């Protein structure tokens, strides 16, 4: 399918992003527990802040100060003295688990910027949620992504990508992006065009039509994604289309 | 609509379809008295072709510069060849073949000779020879020869494939892009489009089956699509939205 965010072709295996779904616990805790969860939260926020602190820098050296400062405000929101008061209260006051309480707050903050049909405000609620997902994972002891982990040059396949993701992404080993996105103006599109790396974004669900490690070639010229082709289809793009650089 | 996206861009316009007046050769054997009208029928027929080629020659010049106009004197030297001429007249006099079928035997045979070597350039000359062949046969057959100089309105050129003799007489200020049933990424249609910075979805199977003449359509050469008679919503979805690639 496709919307065509960025021109180019690519040959490589697909790395399929898997994001551990998040089960928030609703069960009201006992007064006994109250302390433990306040610790769960403070401990979780302690790490999520730490991961955020290395991304700031990796967004920094790669993309510079414009980007390093998107990050300063990510941290500043996660560690907001008032939002802490709110999450903790729900623990002491309404006996909610840390993972359920923090969600309520962040969710209340992201969903309050979405009231306006403002593009940028909708972009903020997006990032406000990016930060909230993080925290819950850590609180939840669920496993964290970290894209610097890259071993192979791969064609990053995912549903969508956010600034926390594309910063730690090992640029000189990702051969393009394929997402279920929205695109043409989304962060993956503007991430690619700039990088001159290919990108088809408005996909319905490549995330279901591809599996991890499947070899494939992203067309991004005529807008086609070829999953596990025959060597002649390979032989085709291989240079037939791939040699669009000569002209 | 498919296409092999030879030329990025987006166009908004009425589709100008290029219906080719069908060429139907006469394989009947004339008698020894009809022999002389045919030499005439060929000769007059050939004169039109030259009249038309020397005008294209010039148009190609003023516009596409000297490289291309020089390419036309080549079409004229072929067409007005004294031996091909002598070989066509003889098939009429000795073999009693119609002016048209005769002309076709000689030129085609001349083209075929070039295609025996899988050589991209030779295969190119062979087409170019079949180009002149078609022009000579229509003119012999007294058929309609299209003057694309004659385009008055801005439009999206919808065709089977576009020939050098065709695009040279093209009023470039009014062609808004091209969609053909073509080959693509290297076809003349494609190289042409790529220079002028005119969009092109060229590998279509048959855009000449869904697209009728005078269909307002938008050619999404950003995302490989062709919208036939788009709803006012789909229009603004590109008209502004997708169309504003130019800004970025």
Swiss-Prot record, chain A:
One of its GO terms (molecular function) is metal ion binding. The modification Phosphotyrosine is found at residue 120. One of its GO terms (biological process) is phosphoenolpyruvate-dependent sugar phosphotransferase system. Phosphorylated on Tyr-120. Phosphorylation on Tyr-120 is important for polar localization but not for interaction with TmaR and for activity. GO terms for cellular component: cytosol. The active site is at 187 (tele-phosphohistidine intermediate). The keyword Transferase applies. Keywords: Cytoplasm, Kinase, Magnesium, Metal-binding, Phosphoprotein, Phosphotransferase system, Sugar transport, Transferase, Transport. General (non sugar-specific) component of the phosphoenolpyruvate-dependent sugar phosphotransferase system (sugar PTS). This major carbohydrate active-transport system catalyzes the phosphorylation of incoming sugar substrates concomitantly with their translocation across the cell membrane. Enzyme I transfers the phosphoryl group from phosphoenolpyruvate (PEP) to the phosphoryl carrier protein (HPr). Can also use (Z)-3-fluoro-PEP (ZFPEP), (Z)-3-methyl-PEP (ZMePEP), (Z)-3-chloro-PEP (ZClPEP) and (E)-3-chloro-PEP (EClPEP) as alternative phosphoryl donors. The reaction takes place in three steps, mediated by a phosphocarrier histidine residue located on the surface of the central domain. The two first partial reactions are catalyzed at an active site located on the N-terminal domain, and the third partial reaction is catalyzed at an active site located on the C-terminal domain. For catalytic turnover, the central domain swivels from the concave surface of the N-terminal domain to that of the C-terminal domain. Belongs to the PEP-utilizing enzyme family. Homodimer. Interacts with the pole-localizer protein TmaR. Binding to TmaR is reversible as long as TmaR can get phosphorylated, whereas binding to non-phosphorylated TmaR is very strong and shifts the equilibrium toward binding. This is Phosphoenolpyruvate-protein phosphotransferase. The lineage of its organism: Bacteria, Pseudomonadati, Pseudomonadota, Gammaproteobacteria, Enterobacterales. The chain holds residues 3 to 249 of 575 of the full protein.
Curated annotation (Swiss-Prot), chain B:
GO terms for molecular function: identical protein binding; kinase activity; metal ion binding; phosphoenolpyruvate-protein phosphotransferase activity. The keyword Metal-binding applies. One of its GO terms (cellular component) is cytosol. General (non sugar-specific) component of the phosphoenolpyruvate-dependent sugar phosphotransferase system (sugar PTS). This major carbohydrate active-transport system catalyzes the phosphorylation of incoming sugar substrates concomitantly with their translocation across the cell membrane. Enzyme I transfers the phosphoryl group from phosphoenolpyruvate (PEP) to the phosphoryl carrier protein (HPr). Can also use (Z)-3-fluoro-PEP (ZFPEP), (Z)-3-methyl-PEP (ZMePEP), (Z)-3-chloro-PEP (ZClPEP) and (E)-3-chloro-PEP (EClPEP) as alternative phosphoryl donors. The N-terminal domain contains the HPr binding site, the central domain the pyrophosphate/phosphate carrier histidine, and the C-terminal domain the pyruvate binding site. Keywords: Cytoplasm, Kinase, Magnesium, Metal-binding, Phosphoprotein, Phosphotransferase system, Sugar transport, Transferase, Transport. The keyword Repeat does not apply. This is Phosphoenolpyruvate-protein phosphotransferase. The reaction takes place in three steps, mediated by a phosphocarrier histidine residue located on the surface of the central domain. The two first partial reactions are catalyzed at an active site located on the N-terminal domain, and the third partial reaction is catalyzed at an active site located on the C-terminal domain. For catalytic turnover, the central domain swivels from the concave surface of the N-terminal domain to that of the C-terminal domain. Belongs to the PEP-utilizing enzyme family. Homodimer. Interacts with the pole-localizer protein TmaR. Binding to TmaR is reversible as long as TmaR can get phosphorylated, whereas binding to non-phosphorylated TmaR is very strong and shifts the equilibrium toward binding. GO terms for biological process: N-acetylglucosamine transport; phosphoenolpyruvate-dependent sugar phosphotransferase system. Phosphorylated on Tyr-121. Phosphorylation on Tyr-121 is important for polar localization but not for interaction with TmaR and for activity. It is found in: Cytoplasm. Its main location: cytoplasm. It comes from Escherichia coli (strain K12). The active site is at residue 188. The modification Phosphotyrosine is found at residue 121.
